[PDB]
Write a protein that binds this ligand. Structure first.
Ligand SMILES: Nc1ncnc2c1ncn2[C@@H]1O[C@H](COP(=O)(O)OP(=O)(O)OP(O)(O)=S)[C@@H](O)[C@H]1O
Ligand SMILES: [Mg+2]
Ligand SMILES: [Zn+2]
Ligand SMILES: [Zn+2]
Lengths: 647, 487
DNA sequence: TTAGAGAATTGGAGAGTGTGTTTTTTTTTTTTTTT
DNA sequence: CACACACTCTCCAATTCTCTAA
């Protein structure tokens, strides 16, 4: 038998209080929630976000005038699933009639309403039928309590404290909690059925079946009164037209590396977003998901197979992300600060020296626009450098400021197919596709195998990576700007040896790079002293030794690229002339020098010069490409070439 | 129509009066087209002409457009119901098409077999139903609603036979009758239809004597130019019935119109327990590939009679590449090739493009690949797109020993433009030796011994060793290619 | 021969005995022949 | 383990039948 227990909650009084709250609450138009229900009746909104701050304010207001409440906020944070049904029932009771001419072109549910009502009425006079969830066209959610900063939050308001996946103990099941973590795997949207709309071949009667079990059994038996009394034994046919579906997405939230105790492994927690919250979560997110932590049961046969050990999921209710005024601000900064010399030092404030490398990194960050083909607007630079030089620090600084920027190493791109056996997903990405409209910081570029060599070669002159797993020949758009940080083999760079001999990169791949910098360290007497002072100051004060203008926000570069991308600075005819004689004399001096053959100016150097000039004008208003721009571009190109011949 | 409060009779009458007396001028004025002056192409009865074309060609499907329903006046509710109730609407449209065609045959006195027309099933293919809906924006209120989709097909399953008409046999009196199958349920007879036998439970299904239809599930993939740059493109499963089968091979890009439908899936095969996730597909009703002439003979004679034909063709081979006069000449001659003399003689031109690394060494390769009818562009060093040689693969799905042909074969008559010919492996270099010498590729692996006819044309382009080609040094010392392969 | 009182049999629901699942070959070592 | 399926064991009232009915 089932015993009985005494619990002081009194659901009926709570329901009366709930109805009073939905009727008699007006935030400091009429009532807020009545206005929301009016909008719902107009079919202009299908999300009743029941805030808990509002319920707390309602309780506080009625505390001074009768205390006509039973701590609802503390009564639904303990059991939220039942109160979702209570709120839905209270909304159906107080649902206002529409106050708008809503088109009813697709009124299948209304058609079923009136049809079944007429069929019942023609015999009711003898001359609930509809499930409560079937009629609802809204989804109800809970917004957790905000910060209290008062004695009310005396360790209470468990939905106020963002927990981690490890701290979600088993005794929180059924409560309305919130977790903080990084999404890792969000599934595709699937229509989860809430109530089926079986129709019988005879007897005319359709019987509905509410289901929340992840698995059900079709009725297929006309148990209707007419069918049973006539013993027709009719079978039932599903009608997806008259059924009710809710979009279902099954996310999965991990925990941040700062929440994991030492020696442990990050945990994970399944999230079941459904309703209007679908597609609000993506794998590259850090969120504070608020939901009801519920024990999904192993209903079926593995049920008896396992036992009391349940599996849990978080029925998400509210997702809070963490991650022309700006145009005026950046315009004013342009007027005040010299972008050319300021943004360069802003990229790597904690990295001393190598200013021209930073200037080239600005051009890569902006990049010219030459989408028209006959070509490409992606700037690629490689820093051959030297062991012990802060190439990796520069790469990380670029990654942390460049939108859609990723950092990766040669030895641990490409792509993998169908990683999980169960779901059997198709065409999982890699590292180059993630930085589609961004930059890939390929550290240890020399130590990167032939497969990735071919992959990056395809990406570099195709902007689209492809696979040939099972003859599908599918491709992934990866228009990523490439930033390489290869380092010389046999340790330190040898200036005497030829540059391509020092690093195991084929001349075919290196020659396609728009600009190349060889930036090696030399033991000096003053540069090292300033470097040591800088690093030690950073260690003391945890902040850079600020000695000049150091802008921080990257939105200025975003504004510049978005501004001049539509502008597309058109090159001048005199510019084209000066660059054709520039190529002529460059090739002439390349011959007369031939010392290292890693120079012969090539059509690709002209394309790189054009795109660098385009990027420079793209930074400075529109159509600024003139002699002034091309002189700086050619100066940068010549300096980069000379860098290969340093000392 | 159930659940709609819509009479089928009024819809049939609307579509009937829309069939004839309708002109393309209504469509021309619907979209506010300025060039509505045309008379023959606008004021003529477009659908009557289409029906006459079907009569004189004996076709079934109709490439009906959706906007033509908006152009006419009484078929606006019909268009909205088509978007909302595609199944019943399409069925009544097909019945109306058949009845209108037989009525036209009766009226115009164009003598024809009425039974032959009645037997043939006539279909309608409403395309351009609406805006190009996104795959990622398929919320579950679009169930049983007409949907337009764009994408590139990944693969296509073979023909899947689905039973349409059952066929039972009385195992005691050899009485056979056919039971129509509706919604995939077997309504087997309770007893023998013949009264002299009327034996219950004496019916056994004769599988091979039934009637089957064609179903071809197609795995559509979201087009790259519309997917968000972050996540990988999603996929949906098509369904193609009774026609349009093999009308879109893998790799094609199509604009598909169909009803977005969802069905339950059995959690356990033995039991009737159904998962509550309702896997979704779409029932295709029309596919459009978004992607020889006497006048042509006259054009051939005109271009052939030109004195400068040779130079003109040389220029047209690589219009965007300057100089390279003789290279284009050689490539042009390769495109034609010698006579295929038989009685083996190759009768083909093999061209290698050496020198220092050249962008044209690639640009002209893509140009000639686009020019040549057959053949395929392939990289010798990478061979990622095509393996460049025929080798046996286990296709994983069914784990079967499928033999997939390389790049050399499948390019008979065509030109197999190789790239990075210097960096290709030695194993495939031996295959190149075999194909250029023997003209066939022979395989002996996993119990399969066979010879594949290649008969291909080689147009390779190999970069040299070092920074650039050295003219003083011989070609062998610069290209890194065995002398027998170069000769 | 007709409208109506008597025997005689057996199919359609249900008591019950025994079934049938969930259930898995990834990833990681170790060997071996070619490369 | 237990819920659902397939099926042997088992059982009365509506359906058929032939002696006595009108
Ligand atoms: N110019 C610089 N300014 C500040 N710190 C620097 C500078 N150069 C080097 N460092 C320091 O050097 C370390 C990072 O150097 P790395 O970039 O790892 O050298 P590396 O050349 O990448 O070494 P590898 O692994 O052989 S490529 C950090 O401790 C930095 O603080
Ligand atoms: Mg490093
Ligand atoms: Zn029934
Ligand atoms: Zn029979």
């Amino acid at each position: 038998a089932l015993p009985s227990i005494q619990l002081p909650v009194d659901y009926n009084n709570l329901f009366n209080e709930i109805t009073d709250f939905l009727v008699t609450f007006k935030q400091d138009k009429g009532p807020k929630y009545m206005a929301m229900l009016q909008k719902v009746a107009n079919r202009e909104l299908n999300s009743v976000i029941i805030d808990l701050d509002d319920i707390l304010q309602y309780q506080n207001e009625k505390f001074l005038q009768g205390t006509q409440a039973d701590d609802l906020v503390s009564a639904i944070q303990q059991n939220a699933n039942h109160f979702t049904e209570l709120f839905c029932r209270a909304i159906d009771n107080n649902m206002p009639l529409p106050t708008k001419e809503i088109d009813y072109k697709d009124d299948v549910l209304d058609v079923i309403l009136n049809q079944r009502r007429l069929r019942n009425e023609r015999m009711l006079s003898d001359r609930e039928l509809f499930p409560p969830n079937l009629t609802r066209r809204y989804f109800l959610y809970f917004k957790p309590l905000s910060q209290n900063c008062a004695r009310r939050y005396r360790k209470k308001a468990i939905s106020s404290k963002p927990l981690s996946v490890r701290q979600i103990k088993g005794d929180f099941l059924g409560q309305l909690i919130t977790v903080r973590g990084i999404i890792t795997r969000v599934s595709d949207v699937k229509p989860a059925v809430e109530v089926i709309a079986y129709t019988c071949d005879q007897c005319g009667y359709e019987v509905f079946q509410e289901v929340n079990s992840r698995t059900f059994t079709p009725l297929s038996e006309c148990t209707s009164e007419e069918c049973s009394q006539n013993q027709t034994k009719g079978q039932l046919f599903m009608s997806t037209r008259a059924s009710k579906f809710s979009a279902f997405q099954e996310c999965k939230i991990q925990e941040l590396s700062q929440q994991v105790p030492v020696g442990h492994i990050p945990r994970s927690l399944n999230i079941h977003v459904n309703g209007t919250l679908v597609r609000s979560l993506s794998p590259g997110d850090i969120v504070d998901v608020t939901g009801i932590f519920l024990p999904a049961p192993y209903t079926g046969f593995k049920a008896l197979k396992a036992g009391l050990l349940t599996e849990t999921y978080l029925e998400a209710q509210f997702v809070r992300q963490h991650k022309s005024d700006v145009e005026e601000r950046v315009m004013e900064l342009i007027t005040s600060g010299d972008v050319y010399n300021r943004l360069a030092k802003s990229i790597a404030p904690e990295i001393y020296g190598n200013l021209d490398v930073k200037k080239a990194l600005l051009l890569l960050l902006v990049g010219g626009v030459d989408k028209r083909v006959g070509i490409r607007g992606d700037i690629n630079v490689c820093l051959m450098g030297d062991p012990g030089v802060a190439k990796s620090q520069l790469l990380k600084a670029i990654c942390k400021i460049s939108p859609r920027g990723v950092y990766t190493t040669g030895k641990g791109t490409a792509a993998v197919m169908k990683d999980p056996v169960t779901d059997e997903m198709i065409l999982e990405g890699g590292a180059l596709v993630l930085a589609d409209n961004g930059i890939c910081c390929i550290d240890e570029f020399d130590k990167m195998d032939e497969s990735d060599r071919t992959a990056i070669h395809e990406v570099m002159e195709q902007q689209t990576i492809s696979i040939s797993k099972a003859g599908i020949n599918t491709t992934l758009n990866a228009r990523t700007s490439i930033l390489a940080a290869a380092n010389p083999l046999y340790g330190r760079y040898n200036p005497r040896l030829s540059p391509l001999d020092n690093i195991n990169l084929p001349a075919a791949l290196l020659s396609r790079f728009d600009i190349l910098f060889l930036m090696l360290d030399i033991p000096s007497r003053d540069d090292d002293e300033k470097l040591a002072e800088h690093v030690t100051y950073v260690h003391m004060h945890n902040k850079q030794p600020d000695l000049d203008f150091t802008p921080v926000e990257p939105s200025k570069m975003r504004e510049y690229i978005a501004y001049a991308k539509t502008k597309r600075p058109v090159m001048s005819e005199a510019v084209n002339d000066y660059v054709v004689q520039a190529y002529i004399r460059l090739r002439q001096d390349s011959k007369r020098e031939m010392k290292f053959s890693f120079g012969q100016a090539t059509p690709r150097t002209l394309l790189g010069i054009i795109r660098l000039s385009q990027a420079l004008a793209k930074l400075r208003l529109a159509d600024m490409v003139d002699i002034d721009d091309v002189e700086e571009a050619l100066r940068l190109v010549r300096v980069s070439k000379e860098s290969l011949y340093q000392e | 129509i159930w659940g709609t409060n819509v009479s089928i009779q009024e819809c049939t009458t609307n579509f009937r009066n829309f069939l004839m007396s309708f002109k393309y001028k209504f469509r021309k004025i619907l979209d506010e087209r300025e060039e509505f002056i045309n008379n023959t192409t606008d004021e003529e009865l477009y659908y009557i002409k289409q029906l006459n074309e079907m009569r004189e060609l004996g076709t079934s499907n109709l490439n009906l457009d959706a906007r033509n329903l908006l152009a006419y006046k009484q078929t606006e509710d019909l268009y909205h119901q088509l978007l909302n109730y595609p199944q019943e609407v399409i069925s009544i449209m097909d019945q109306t098409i058949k009845d209108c065609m037989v009525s036209l045959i009766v009226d115009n006195n164009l003598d024809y077999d009425l039974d032959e027309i009645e037997t043939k099933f006539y279909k309608v293919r409403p395309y351009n139903v609406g805006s190009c809906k996104g795959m990622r924006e398929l919320n579950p209120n679009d169930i049983d609603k007409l949907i337009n989709l764009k994408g590139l097909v990944l693969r296509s399953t073979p023909v899947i036979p689905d039973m349409k008409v059952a066929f039972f046999k009385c195992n005691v009196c050899d009485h056979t009758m056919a039971v129509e199958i509706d919604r995939g349920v077997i309504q087997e007879p309770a007893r023998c239809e013949r009264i002299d036998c009327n034996e219950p439970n004496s019916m056994s299904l004769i599988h091979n004597r039934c009637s089957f239809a064609d179903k071809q599930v197609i795995k559509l993939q979201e087009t790259p130019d519309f997917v968000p740059d972050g996540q990988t493109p999603h996929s949906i499963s098509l369904c193609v019935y009774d026609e349009l089968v093999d009308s879109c091979r893998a790799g094609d890009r199509i604009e598909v119109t169909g009803t977005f439908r969802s069905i339950p899936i059995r959690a356990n095969s033995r039991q009737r327990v159904l998962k509550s996730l309702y896997k979704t597909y779409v029932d295709v009703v029309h596919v459009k590939k978004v992607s020889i002439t006497d006048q042509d003979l006259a054009k051939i004679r005109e271009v052939a009679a030109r004195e400068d034909l040779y130079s003109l063709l040389a220029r047209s081979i690589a219009p965007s590449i300057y100089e390279l006069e003789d290279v284009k000449k050689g490539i042009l001659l390769q495109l034609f090739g010698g006579t295929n003399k038989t009685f083996r003689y190759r009768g083909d031109i093999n061209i290698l493009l050496c020198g220092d690394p050249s962008t044209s060494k690639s640009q002209i390769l893509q140009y000639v690949h686009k020019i040549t009818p057959r053949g395929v562009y392939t990289s010798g060093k990478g061979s990622s797109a095509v393996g460049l040689t025929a080798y046996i693969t286990r296709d994983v799905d069914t784990k079967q020993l499928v033999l997939e042909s390389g790049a050399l074969v499948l390019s008979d008559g065509g030109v197999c433009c190789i790239d990075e010919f210097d960096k290709m492996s030695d194993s495939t270099r031996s295959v190149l030796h075999e194909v250029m010498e023997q003209q066939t590729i022979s395989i002996a692996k996993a119990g399969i011994i066979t010879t594949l006819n290649a008969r291909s044309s080689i147009l390779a382009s190999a970069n040299p060793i070092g920074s650039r080609y050295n003219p003083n040094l011989p070609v062998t010392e610069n290209i890194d290619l065995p002398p027998p392969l170069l000769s």
